[PDB]
Design a protein around this nucleic acid. Structure first.
Lengths: 198, 106, 82, 97, 95, 198, 98, 80, 109, 95, 198, 198
DNA sequence: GGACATGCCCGGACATGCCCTATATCTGACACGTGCCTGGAGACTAGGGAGTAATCCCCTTGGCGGTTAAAACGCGGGGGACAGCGCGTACGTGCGTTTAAGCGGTGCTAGAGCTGTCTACGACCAATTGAGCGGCCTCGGCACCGGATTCTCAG
DNA sequence: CTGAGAATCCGGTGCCGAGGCCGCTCAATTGGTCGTAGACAGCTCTAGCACCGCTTAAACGCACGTACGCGCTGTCCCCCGCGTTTTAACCGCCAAGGGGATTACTCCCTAGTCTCCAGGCACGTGTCAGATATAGGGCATGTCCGGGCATGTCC
């Protein structure tokens, strides 16, 4: 890519924050978040709930975008995409292009963008205020390669950047978290947390 | 058997030769018996000092044979010898490696 | 009769002499003065040497004549006889 | 191409020639000069080899010493380049001029 | 077969006394001979003048000693006088 | 070359300084910097991060240039270039000319210059400020021969000169560091640091 | 205002005055005390003839005058007029006294 | 002792004037004193040496004349 | 016995041939001395005395003095290039120095 | 009546009266003249002795004296002194 | 594929046999053969020597063909090919098509076939008789995917079938061996041999 | 190359054999032969004497040719040539092409061939019967790259094949020996001889 | 979910580069031997120069007083030392050319050096005496004082 | 231009040191003798001069750039010059004593000569250290690979 998306946290006017479920670390867990690392550990194609919290409600037409970038500075300009194998396999949900790493599940209004200028992939849905009785809006992401996929992420860590944007695409808020897509989220989360002490 | 005055004195320079050179130098009509002994003794002492220093300089130069350069170093490095030989030029001696400070680079 | 042999004392020779004397830079005008000084030295030393040679009823200047001349001029030279 | 800074090679030559002992004046021109001056003192002189070597050793020692003193007088005047006036001052103070 | 005058054997013995591992070249030997002869002439001449100035017709050890004190520097004069006196006293006892 | 590039440190108006990572000296660490020697030790073609620090942000259009020169004065006029073997091997990234020693990795806006007057090679990218939170910009260089390559650097040490330039190429700041490209950076760094005591 | 000569006129006048004459310029008795003081550091209870001290004084003044001549020539060589210790040290170094 | 101060500032100035100097730095006086003193040490040493060799207790004018002559500067007017 | 007449008178000289001869004999210079050596030496000494006294007299009259003083001797010696060379290392007591001012020291208009 | 003290005073005065009949001499100046003559005497006699020694000569003659004078005296001074000495010696030999 | 190539050993008229080198089981030996398993263990793209032994010399024009098939009966009809990643990477030697698993190295007369009827890939070279003072002919194969490549062999064992053919493709002889392409041939060979006792 | 030169020893009608000097295995040894290994160890561009022995004298017009090939079978078809660095350096003797590994020194009648069909380099001289006093003719070869030259032999062992041929290049005899061109022939010879016991 | 399955990374260690030094070959000059001869050592002699002791006197040391000229000290200022700066030119450095210095061989003759002989010449010694030195006296050149004249400096 | 401070000159008075004279004494002269040394002749044989030829390293001429000498300017500090106070240098005068010069007596210390012998110095000789190249010997620094970790997989 010609550029690198900013990853700076920006709660903005609406007090935009992310929240995550309290899943523990059974080696088999499908999706578990580490507050210590600000890092999600999840299995390929499994549901990854991300909560959007705001202090006040953004205007109708507000959208929520997700984009991955490599975390290591020397890889930052390389577009994050699916590996050749997963790109070719027949797992598209009818909505998502085959090469997109990040999908949103359960939303008919999802759009997938392949930016003509930056070459970045992203997935965007309309922002919906929480259901009455709820304090947050949950979006369900799927990650469609493992961090280890050869010819893809190839064992490089990524960040997911979640942006709140207005109807023109202008920035309203931004947050991010690290992601590891792997076979054993609970095992790998405990390992990386333990290594913090090393 | 004949035994010489240098042998009785335990010295290396020849008492007889120094005595003859004094007698034939048109210096005085008489010469005492002790004068050539004293003169020869001073000459041994000075020779020993100069050869000592020149040998030292040779060893510093990783040389086993003293050369005129080493003699020049010995005479010019020793304050009292340089004074004694202040108006003496040693051939093939060269000069001391001395550089004025103001001429060194900044 | 040798003529204009003073030009045989070349500029680089005088430069080398100055280097041995510790001189770092030499003006172009130095050379004639140095040549004159050298000439003066020679006229005095040789005069004494030849004087000794003539007194000794010889026609060849000997090394001892020169060494003695130098000694009597205070510039005693070691290495050619005492 | 490459070019040495002014001063480095001069110093290198000073060290080189102060470390060694070979004569710096050419034998044949020195002999020719000595013989030329001699014709005006006494005719058809013959000179021993050790006599010419003696004159050359004496001359080179005298000039080296004079150049040492000249350099000291020049540096005293906060200069580096030697001048004719430097030679004349050195010889006057030595008492031959 | 023209006999000459040099101190070569005595200089070599003293050198072997002080450094029995070092040699000496011909030019260096010539310089040592010139040096010793020069010193000799200087000291003998000063002693001769000393004796004449004092109306003395004999060369004795006191004029030699005084001349050495005049010509040699401080430590050189002191060490030379000490060695000369010890050597002359030992010879005089040995006769 | 007809000339030699200046190597004088010049922080200039923007307080331009370099920074480097704290990599240790494990035998084959890919890239490690020695503060004692101001020298980078790195493997051929591996990522070499160099941080650009400034006290204030230079104008848009500012560029960052890297150039190698031989450190030893008698070699200074010789253009630093790749050896005949690596020049010929098929390792170009599609952006860099085959004879250039220094590449930038992960930057689509990289330019490679072969100076018509000086004959010097250099690689230049646009300067990008960090995000208001971050404190420095990192550029990732690759060195494409070993210091030992015969017919190339042939065991001669080099300096990398980093210059900050305006859009016309006028000088804004300059810094430099020595570089050894070698198989065992950690081994070689410790050897040279030890020899400092000798 | 009282009369005052510019710097130098009076200097030249004393130069002319003392270069015309030959009478001694250093005081006899302080020099004599110095000579006896210096002498006890070689031999105690030493005596001096009057003509011996006068000879030493004549020699000293001639030596100093010549040294000051050479010092002045070295100062003038350096496009200076006022003599300073480094001038004395150069004059004595070139003479071979150092 | 203090007797070096008996060769006073105006005395060094007068000697320097006969040497032809027009201006005298303040740092000149001690230098001149040192030079003069060294000269005296060497001269008096030789003179006393001559006096002792003659088995005398008083340094004579002739002792000084010989010392000066051997120092390399012959003095006329005091005998010899 | 023939009338006694001295060798100095026979040679037309004023310095004493006998005394110079005795001083040569007793100066410990050689065991033997020729008859002509002291004559030659006396002649050179007389010549040098006559020239120095001539110049000193000239200086004395230039100063309107009829008696030679050391100042006149010093002036005579230093004003002659060859005498100054011969006596380059001689200091004359009560002689003073030659009047001489370097050009750079003179005042300027 | 003290001991016999030799000097050149009467001879200096005779030469002075030859060259300057109406000029006198002070005691200090006469002392300077005596110092001068004695110094020259010492220089010439010493150089002649050394010259003779160098040439293995045991007799003091007029050739070494003349050569010594030529060494010590400057050019025209040497020529005049040599001329005077030769004329004087040949005239003496005529007697 | 519409068919499955026969794997029956057939020494035929010329007494055609295979031989293999005695390489040991060092963890990462490039190529090692197991007589117990009739199985070659080798690294990706590394030289795999296979010896052709015959009792008598086949006619000029005789060719040697190599073809891979999956060993497990349910996979036998699936064409063995390179995975999507290795297929796309830039490692062709100028002779071999990118999707062929098996290459011959060091033979200008190599031909690669993509059978129009069976869809099978194969690589064929002319049979060269051993120097009359020699015992066998060695062919050097390269295997261009690991057995584990996802989207490719995907951890399924394969057989290599070597056929001696006349000029026309007529069966003169046939032999075969199992192949595992892996990172650590020595480790993996010893493991499978140990498991024989289990 | 399309082919591989035969390396079979063939003494032929004239009883053609090679001989070598008895040089030991010390430091400062420029050429030493190992009978145990039939291998010459020599320094780059140093004289390597090879003796030609025959039982009877071949006809006038007989020539002696030297050619290198890689010893390892998988490299045999690769033409042995100088590396890019030595190819470019200025060391030609005025007779040998820059890319030829093997030169003959001290022979004006030397010819260098670049075979149009096989692409092989070789160097040929006229055979001359032994000089009075000798039972062998000595040829002096120079090897112009180290075995280790990158981009050249790249640490692969070679054989030198010495052929006695007629005017029409027909074969009269053949012999060969292994060659290692290296910095320390004595060191390396002793090492490889020791390893024979391992 | 635990137990493997299976690729990747890299520190260990070898492969194999290159310089780095210490060990193998010439030369004339220096270190040792030999023969001889002449200069140094032992012994005896005279004689005179030096050591020592008494004497005398002069000349060096020490003290007192005054008085005055010179040395010490203060202070104002101006001009000279000294630091900084610009420039331009003369000198340092490098390179191609040429020139003569150096080295090696060869000749011969001028002249240094050694030896033999003998005669002129200088040491030595005794008697003589007259030249030269010490002492005393005197007068004139020079020195000291003062006042007018001229020069020279600075405002 | 002019006034004032310093130097010069001119004359008068005194004083003390240079010039002259006289006694004396010892040192030069004269006359004769004898050893020796050096002047001259003559022979040897060494080395200095002259030349030729080849080589190559040094000198030389020139191009060019730039560092330093030199001229100019500003500053400030510290040396000169003059007025005032102090002190000690000098001159004169006297007293004492000590050591320097002198003379006389003695004795021992060194030249001179003889006889002998051993050390030192030409002549001869051989071998060892200086430079270069070959043998150990260190670093100089790339490539391969076993181990151990990373990470997928599943009954």
């Amino acid at each position: 890519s010609s550029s690198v998306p900013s990853q700076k946290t920006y709660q903005g006017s609406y007090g935009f924050r992310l929240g995550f479920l309290h899943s523990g670390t059974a080696k088999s867990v499908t999706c578990t978040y580490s507050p210590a690392l600000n890092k999600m550990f999840c299995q390929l194609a499994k549901t990854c709930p991300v909560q959007l919290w705001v202090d006040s409600t953004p205007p109708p037409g507000t959208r929520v975008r997700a984009m991955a970038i490599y975390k290591q500075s020397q890889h930052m300009t390389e577009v994050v995409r699916r590996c050749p194998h997963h790109e070719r396999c027949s797992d598209s949900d009818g909505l998502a292009p085959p090469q997109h790493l990040i999908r949103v599940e359960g939303n008919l209004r999802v759009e997938y963008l392949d930016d003509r200028n930056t070459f970045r992939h992203s997935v965007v849905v309309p922002y919906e205020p929480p259901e009455v009785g709820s304090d947050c809006t949950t979006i369900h992401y799927n990650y469609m390669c493992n961090s280890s996929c050869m010819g893809g992420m190839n064992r490089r860590p990524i960040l997911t950047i979640i942006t709140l944007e207005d109807s023109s695409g202008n920035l309203l808020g931004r947050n991010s978290f690290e992601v590891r897509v792997c076979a054993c989220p609970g095992r790998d989360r405990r390992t990386e947390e333990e290594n913090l002490r090393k | 058997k004949a035994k010489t005055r240098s042998s009785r004195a335990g010295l290396q320079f020849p008492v007889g030769r120094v005595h003859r050179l004094l007698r034939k130098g048109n210096y005085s009509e008489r010469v005492g018996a002790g004068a050539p002994v004293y003169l020869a003794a001073v000459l041994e002492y000075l020779t020993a000092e100069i050869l000592e220093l020149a040998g030292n300089a040779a060893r510093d130069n990783k040389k086993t044979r003293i050369i005129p350069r080493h003699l020049q170093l010995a005479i010019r490095n020793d304050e009292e010898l340089n004074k004694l030989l202040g108006r003496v030029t040693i051939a093939q001696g060269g000069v001391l490696p001395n550089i004025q400070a103001v001429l060194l680079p900044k | 009769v040798l003529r204009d042999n003073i030009q045989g004392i070349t500029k680089p020779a005088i430069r080398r002499l100055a280097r041995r004397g510790g001189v770092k830079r030499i003006s172009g005008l130095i050379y004639e003065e140095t040549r004159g000084v050298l000439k003066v030295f020679l006229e005095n030393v040789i005069r004494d040497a030849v004087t000794y040679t003539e007194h000794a009823k010889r026609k060849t200047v000997t090394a001892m004549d020169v060494v003695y001349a130098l000694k009597r001029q205070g510039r005693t030279l070691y290495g050619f006889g005492g | 191409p490459h070019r040495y800074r002014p001063g480095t090679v001069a110093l290198r030559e000073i060290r080189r020639y102060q470390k060694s002992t070979e004569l710096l004046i050419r034998k044949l021109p020195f002999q020719r000069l000595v013989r030329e001056i001699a014709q005006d003192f006494k005719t058809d002189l013959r000179f021993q080899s050790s006599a010419v070597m003696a004159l050359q050793e004496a001359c080179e020692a005298y000039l080296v010493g004079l150049f040492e003193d000249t350099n000291l007088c020049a540096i005293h005047a906060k200069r580096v380049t030697i001048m004719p006036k430097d030679i004349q001052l050195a010889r006057r103070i030595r008492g031959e001029r | 077969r023209s006999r000459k005058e040099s101190y070569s054997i005595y200089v070599y013995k003293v050198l072997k006394q002080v450094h029995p591992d070092t040699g000496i070249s011909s030019k260096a030997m010539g310089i040592m001979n010139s040096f010793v002869n020069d010193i000799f002439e200087r000291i003998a001449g000063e002693a001769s003048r000393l004796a004449h100035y004092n109306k003395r017709s004999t060369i004795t050890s006191r004029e030699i000693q005084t001349a050495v004190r005049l010509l040699l520097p401080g430590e050189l004069a002191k060490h030379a006088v000490s060695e000369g006196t010890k050597a002359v006293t030992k010879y005089t006892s040995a006769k």
